[PDB]
């Protein structure tokens, strides 16, 4: 019996490749909603595309309708404007844009604007009659504020948190003139959010940080085997969104569709709020009784290139 | 009618293959004898890859001709943005590029294609045919020039007309640099030196399409939308793909190329800032006794342009 599931995420090409990852294994995992982000996109287009994804598949392969989301989160430091972009010309691609699917999507999306993504989160989590996975593909905004907001009436609702971000025992990605490297994109967008998420007890959260996601980089030669299956629309989708980098988010999801794909590591993880170079860096804590996350060790290459490339043949 | 010899000198970018398909659709019109890649706006490797990968897939759904496709040996005087070059390199692993049958079909006709020299076989195709051929320049003007350096009059004789996407004459450029004062166009700035010979050059007939007329027709995205109307179509998958990830140059100039009634035109005498300056590689009209005039396009027919597009991507 598939599982729920809740998408947090911020709209680039990966987000959207973790949605369909998602989406596509109905036999593991029911989408019951998704959030939209303002960090590594631009939360309309995210939103629409996402919409638009939805519906496509809805009438391919008869993936249930959910709500969508926008977040009203806000970046502590924001995400370079050079990235941000992309979303927007998703919303323009074709495969995107077929009229049933976008009447469909025109029809019900005057009902999903009215929906804020973190009220959306806690509603549907704590709404479920069974635990909900939430992948977060974004920052830790939203699951912060559900705490926050909610904390344990929230948490004991969540099956687990299995999260893109970080950096153990690696370098990081955020090279800027005050930094020092080795802090990770989600989590430096908003270091006090992850900090709350990290150190909640109660709470299980499975971590893809750059430890894992580094070994499975995007390929030109693996990427045009989409050309393979033109007759499904979803490779069509998918390899034009990689075709334009690892792939963080889509690893993430693919964990949630099936464990196999990397095994874990119990660490305590605290996150650097203050401002430092290194602020926004995912660090082991030798603080008492601290609440361990289960970060992600040597994942399983050929599975999750394998799983991509079957799920894309959904429709 | 009877259809036309035409060569496309392009560099690449998403525009250069929006022309493309639209010159290579249009086979009642335009019969396309070759194609070269020049690595301006692009790494001329995907850009010859991606020239390739397309034929093929046209070749193999629709009555098409196959033709060579050199890579040209010109270099940059200014090169173009790091970031804008690699579009190509993004295309060439496009999954509708990308389908087997079609890249086997370009793996068994490559070999014959990477050994031509872009440069000489744009000449070899002008000067060898039968009746005069049109050149469409999409890219920089560095392989006509070439080709009028080495063999003059007994190449710009037998070029019927050369519709060049460059320039900006009484608008201001895009050329934004440091550096510059903003009044040149890229394709121009790319190699000034080679702009002037060819808009310099007596004896040969120039179809300018500048700044001043590709400005009015912007790429909007409720059109770039409308291929989704048509997505069993390989061609309309292809086009709205990259559009969607501004105007339409290139693809107007090679319209033009299909159905001259895209624009009317204006006698103008065109020389070329190749000065290291400003306002390098700026496009600017000169007095000069007996000048050769260029007949540089106006208020091209956006509706008409639009829609030859939309139905040249149900090709295939
Ligand atoms: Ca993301
Ligand atoms: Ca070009």
């Given at each position: 019996?598939?599982?729920?599931?809740?998408?947090?995420?911020?709209?680039?090409?990966?987000?959207?490749?973790?949605?369909?990852?998602?989406?596509?294994?109905?036999?593991?995992?029911?989408?019951?909603?998704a959030l939209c982000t303002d960090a590594d996109?631009?939360?309309?287009?995210?939103?629409?595309?996402?919409?638009?994804?939805?519906?496509?598949?809805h009438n391919n392969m008869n993936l249930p309708?959910?709500?969508?989301?926008?977040?009203?989160?806000?970046?502590?430091?924001?995400?370079?404007?050079?990235?941000?972009?992309?979303?927007?010309?998703?919303?323009?691609?074709?495969?995107?844009?077929?009229?049933?699917?976008?009447?469909?999507?025109?029809?019900?999306?005057?009902?999903?604007?009215?929906?804020?993504?973190?009220?959306?989160?806690?509603?549907?989590?704590?709404?479920?009659?069974?635990?909900?996975?939430?992948?977060?593909?974004?920052?830790?905004?939203?699951?912060?504020?559900?705490?926050?907001?909610?904390?344990?009436?929230?948490?004991?609702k969540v099956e687990e948190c299995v999260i893109?971000?970080?950096?153990?025992?690696?370098?990081?990605?955020?090279?800027?003139?005050?930094?020092?490297?080795?802090?990770?994109?989600?989590?430096?967008?908003?270091?006090?959010?992850?900090?709350?998420?990290?150190?909640?007890?109660?709470?299980?959260?499975?971590?893809?940080?750059?430890?894992?996601?580094?070994?499975?980089?995007?390929?030109?030669?693996?990427?045009?085997?989409?050309?393979?299956?033109?007759?499904?629309?979803?490779?069509?989708?998918?390899?034009?969104?990689?075709?334009?980098?690892?792939?963080?988010?889509?690893?993430?999801?693919?964990?949630?569709?099936?464990?196999?794909?990397?095994?874990?590591?119990?660490?305590?993880?605290?996150?650097?709020?203050?401002?430092?170079?290194?602020?926004?860096?995912?660090?082991?804590?030798?603080?008492?009784?601290?609440?361990?996350?289960?970060?992600?060790?040597?994942?399983?290459?050929?599975?999750?290139?394998?799983?991509?490339?079957?799920?894309?043949?959904?429709?």
């Amino acid at each position: 019996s598939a599982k729920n599931v809740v998408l947090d995420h911020d709209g680039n090409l990966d987000d959207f490749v973790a949605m369909v990852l998602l989406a596509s294994n109905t036999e593991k995992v029911r989408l019951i909603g998704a959030l939209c982000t303002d960090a590594d996109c631009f939360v309309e287009n995210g939103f629409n595309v996402t919409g638009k994804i939805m519906c496509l598949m809805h009438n391919n392969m008869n993936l249930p309708l959910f709500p969508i989301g926008k977040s009203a989160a806000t970046a502590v430091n924001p995400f370079p404007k050079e990235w941000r972009c992309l979303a927007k010309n998703m919303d323009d691609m074709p495969i995107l844009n077929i009229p049933e699917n976008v009447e469909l999507w025109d029809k019900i999306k005057a009902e999903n604007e009215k929906y804020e993504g973190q009220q959306l989160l806690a509603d549907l989590v704590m709404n479920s009659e069974e635990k909900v996975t939430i992948c977060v593909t974004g920052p830790l905004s939203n699951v912060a504020w559900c705490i926050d907001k909610y904390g344990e009436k929230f948490t004991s609702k969540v099956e687990e948190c299995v999260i893109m971000g970080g950096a153990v025992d690696v370098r990081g990605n955020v090279f800027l003139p005050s930094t020092d490297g080795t802090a990770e994109w989600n989590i430096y967008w908003d270091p006090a959010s992850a900090k709350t998420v990290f150190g909640c007890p109660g709470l299980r959260r499975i971590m893809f940080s750059l430890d894992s996601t580094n070994t499975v980089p995007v390929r030109s030669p693996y990427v045009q085997r989409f050309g393979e299956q033109t007759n499904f629309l979803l490779s069509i989708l998918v390899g034009t969104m990689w075709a334009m980098y690892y792939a963080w988010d889509a690893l993430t999801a693919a964990y949630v569709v099936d464990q196999k794909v990397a095994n874990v590591d119990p660490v305590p993880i605290d996150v650097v709020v203050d401002k430092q170079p290194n602020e926004g860096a995912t660090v082991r804590t030798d603080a008492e009784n601290y609440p361990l996350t289960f970060v992600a060790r040597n994942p399983e290459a050929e599975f999750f290139l394998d799983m991509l490339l079957r799920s894309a043949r959904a429709c």
